[PDB]
Design a protein around this ligand. Structure first.
Ligand SMILES: CC(=O)Nc1nc(C)c(-c2cc3c(c(S(N)(=O)=O)c2)C(=O)N=C3)s1
Length: 822
């Protein structure tokens, strides 16, 4: 019945749906019901899409940001296949017609009714794009393999779609009654509070009277705040901090002064507080659900009788350029004076205007919101700024989502990590961002995939557990089939957790080979073989993890014993030979963010025609200190290469030549030049990427080389110079760039040219990183917690410099890095 979906969702999110009901909360109850009906509307629209439109849902195109190639094509009900000489500039339609003419001769007797599936994968090639503009063809051309595609008819694609179906009057000062506590401490107890509107204060922070660590301490004091009640903004947020004194932080707690129906909150409130590292504005406005052992304040918010926030209709009724590109009071007031001409001539400066409006005075808010509701939509870049906690107001928030609707699915994917973390800054469950992310997730299954996992990865955190569970529950109402697909993934990871816990215990007692043999026995059980096999990869749902290749599975010797899990496929061939690494015990978010930013750098470089040959490999947290990492096969560490062990192809007279002999052995004869280029390009990319991102602790063990020449980085424990990390040039890579010559300035200075181009391209999108890192502060990443972390980026890119000045400064750091190389 309905009941089976509920128990499946419950298992899928790690939080039973009985628990949502047991709160008796009207906001939860109205989120669930209102978002259920919204996601079910999507699910209906989804099942009546056309077959091409369904491919757009299920397998959205992997596109890149003349010349010949072999393509091998087959038809779905056949092993008999054909090979074709085609051009890289031809459409899929041209190729599909080629296939049908070779079939109509072999079988002796329309291209529009087909889609090319990438063999043994959930990737499809269709639409009016040249072959080399598809990521599969482009990947294939660099790596050198023949494409393997399959003609899938529309009736068979529709068969897939089928089987997935489901007010101003009050001028008194705002005040409270601080009643009492119920907590523990080692002195006297002070309760400082404050009215914040985002980061900014609506008035100074009024303390409570000092009182002894008496219980369960009692106060029964008025606190009177320096602000009229009519001047409270819609997102007025009252923020407490309980600490002790003769500073000693103990707890904190926030709540919105207006409830989710716009009503002002009266009367009594028990705030269940959270422990501390004093006053914490951006902290969540929901209480600690650990009600048993939580320090709890009770307070009263005076009755003033039922007063709702004014409806929008009521609100709407009620030297200049030189600065506009931190400002002084007169400059702020000149920016406010000319607010109408900001709307008319400089609409991209909305943010700076929003940071000069007095949010603690209500006429100014209406005068602002009046400008805001006719304000033209801004570019995607500008809207990512307005999502930050710096702009808490709902109309500004709702305006931002309105300017972000024109995000492409690829862009939305690009920023999905950051957008999810902004859900933590949200004050209420039902919000324009949630609905936006949910509606786009339900319109694109890849977006839907990754939204699920970004949320599912944080259910171990009580502050977001309720929000995230509910969103996940809503998504599942709107995609029964993808729920089941994801359960299969989660069942795989449950088994990997249990197999990894075995491997840890075992490794501490017996030898490496005997633990590996005993891992393989455990995997060869029905329950494991079934669970570990025949799923989609959480790292990339278009990757199919088919036959778990137990022989080649192992574990790595590092402290947490990450498992090495290899998968094969009959239908896919070499594309089906894929590896994943399950790591349990480490917080992979730090890594994931670092790889996504390098991926973005790659995207931004390719958009200016620069292909530095990066390796943007999957990294995805899936659970508490648990996640997956995509295996880049056919690669080894600089450490393992430079070991220089004998009876190998890299038998080297000098350790400087170990890499170059290694590259030689893997790329013999004419192909050595192609790999040194791959190496050089990739070396330059990661050199810049590490310098901008401030990635420290780089040694041979955590730098890998692919057998193509491509270099890339692993293990991102520290970033943004969290030990001012300088540019890193390594002699043995310099040796490879220079083709093993001691003096080869032409090949070396090309590499400086690549590094400089790469560095100047990121400086132009400096604001994109600044905005995206600003939104990431929401995550509570230990090394992304303050302004000096964001200042690192500003200084690494040199964002307040002229392009000429910054390039001069970059070349100092580069020449310094060159000197350091021996
Ligand atoms: C042939 C081979 O081995 N290729 C590899 N490709 C990748 C992507 C590896 C990797 C990446 C990362 C991490 C690890 S690991 N083993 O340290 O967990 C391993 C980690 O922790 N963060 C990122 S290894």
């Amino acid at each position: 019945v309905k009941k089976l979906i509920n128990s499946q969702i419950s298992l899928l999110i790690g939080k039973g749906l009985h628990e949502f009901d047991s709160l008796r909360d009207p906001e939860v109850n109205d989120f669930r019901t209102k978002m259920r009906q919204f996601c079910e509307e999507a699910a209906a629209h989804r099942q009546q899409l056309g077959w091409v439109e369904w491919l757009q849902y299920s397998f959205p195109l992997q596109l890149e940001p003349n010349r010949a190639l072999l393509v091998n094509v087959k038809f779905e009900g056949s092993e008999e296949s054909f090979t074709f000489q085609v051009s890289t500039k031809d459409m899929p339609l041209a190729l599909m017609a080629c296939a049908l003419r070779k079939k109509a001769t072999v079988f002796r007797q329309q291209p529009e009714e087909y889609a090319l599936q990438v063999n043994g994968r959930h990737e499809y090639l269709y639409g009016n794009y040249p072959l080399c503009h598809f990521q599969y063809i482009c990947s294939c051309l660099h790596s050198g393999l023949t494409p393997h595609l399959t003609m899938v008819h529309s009736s068979s694609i529709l068969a897939m779609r089928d089987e997935q179906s489901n007010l101003w009057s009050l001028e008194q000062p705002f005040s409270i009654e601080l009643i009492e506590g119920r907590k523990v401490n080692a002195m006297k107890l002070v309760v400082q509070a404050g009215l914040f509107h985002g980061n900014e204060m609506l008035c100074k922070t009024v303390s409570s009277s000092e009182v002894n660590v008496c219980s369960e301490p009692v106060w029964k004091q008025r606190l009177e705040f320096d602000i009229s009640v009519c001047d409270l903004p819609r997102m007025a947020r009252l923020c407490f901090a309980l600490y002790a004194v003769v500073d000693c932080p103990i707890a904190w707690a926030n709540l919105m002064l207006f409830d989710y129906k716009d009503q002002l909150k009266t009367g009594e409130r028990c705030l269940y507080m959270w422990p501390s590292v004093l006053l914490n504005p951006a902290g969540t406005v929901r209480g600690n659900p650990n009600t048993e052992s939580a320090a709890a304040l009770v307070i009263y918010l005076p009755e003033v009788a039922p007063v709702y926030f004014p409806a929008l209709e009521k609100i709407l009724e009620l030297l200049r350029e030189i600065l506009e590109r931190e400002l002084y009071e007169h400059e702020k007031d000149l920016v406010w004076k000319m607010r109408h001409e900001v709307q008319e001539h400089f609409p991209e400066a909305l943010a700076r205007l929003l940071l000069v409006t007095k949010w603690n005075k209500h006429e100014d808010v209406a005068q602002m919101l009046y400008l805001l509701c006719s304000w033209p939509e801004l570019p995607v870049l500008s809207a990512l700024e307005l999502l930050d906690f710096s702009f808490p107001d709902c109309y500004v928030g709702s305006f931002a989502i309105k300017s972000l609707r024109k995000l492409t699915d690829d862009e939305l994917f690009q920023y999905l990590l950051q957008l999810v973390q902004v859900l933590k800054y949200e004050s209420y469950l039902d919000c324009e961002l949630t609905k936006f992310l949910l509606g786009r997730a339900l319109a694109n299954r890849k977006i839907g995939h990754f939204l699920f996992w970004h949320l599912r990865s944080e259910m171990h955190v009580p502050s977001v557990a309720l929000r995230f569970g509910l969103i996940m529950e809503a998504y599942c109402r709107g995609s029964t089939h993808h729920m089941k697909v994801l359960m299969k993934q989660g069942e795989a990871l449950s088994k990997l957790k249990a197999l990894n816990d075995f491997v840890k215990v075992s490794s501490q007692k017996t030898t490496k080979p005997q633990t590996k043999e005993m891992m393989h026995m455990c995997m060869r059980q029905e329950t494991y073989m079934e669970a570990l096999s025949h799923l989609q990869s959480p790292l990339d749902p278009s990757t199919l993890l088919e036959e778990v290749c137990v022989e080649q599975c192992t574990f790595m010797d590092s402290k947490m014993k990450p498992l090495w899990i290899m998968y094969s496929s009959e239908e896919a061939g070499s594309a089906g030979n894929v590896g994943i690494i399950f790591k349990n015990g480490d917080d992979l978010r730090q890594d994931m963010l670092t790889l996504q930013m390098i991926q973005l750098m790659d995207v931004l470089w390719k958009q200016e025609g620069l292909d530095l040959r990066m390796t943007p490999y999957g990294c995805l947290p899936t659970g508490d200190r648990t996640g997956l990492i995509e295996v880049v096969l056919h690669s080894d560490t600089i450490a393992n290469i430079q070991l220089n062990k004998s009876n190998m192809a890299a038998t080297a007279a000098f350790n400087k030549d170990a890499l170059l002999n290694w590259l030689k052995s893997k790329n013999p004869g004419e192909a050595l030049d192609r790999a040194i280029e791959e190496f050089t390009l990739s070396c330059a990319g990661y050199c810049v990427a590490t310098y901008v991102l401030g990635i420290g602790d780089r040694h041979s063990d955590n730098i890998m080389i692919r057998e193509s020449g491509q270099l890339f980085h692993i293990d991102f424990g520290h970033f943004l110079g969290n030990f001012r990390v300088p540019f890193i040039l390594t002699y043995d890579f310099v040796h490879v760039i220079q083709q093993g010559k001691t003096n080869n300035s032409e090949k070396f200075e090309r590499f400086r040219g690549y590094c400089e181009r790469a560095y100047t391209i990121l400086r132009r999108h400096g604001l994109l990183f600044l905005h995206l890192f600003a939104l990431m502060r929401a995550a509570g990443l230990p090394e992304l917690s303050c302004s000096k972390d964001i200042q690192y980026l500003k200084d690494s890119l040199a964002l307040g410099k002229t392009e000429e000045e910054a390039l001069k400064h970059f070349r100092v750091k580069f020449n310094e890095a060159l000197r350091e190389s021996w």
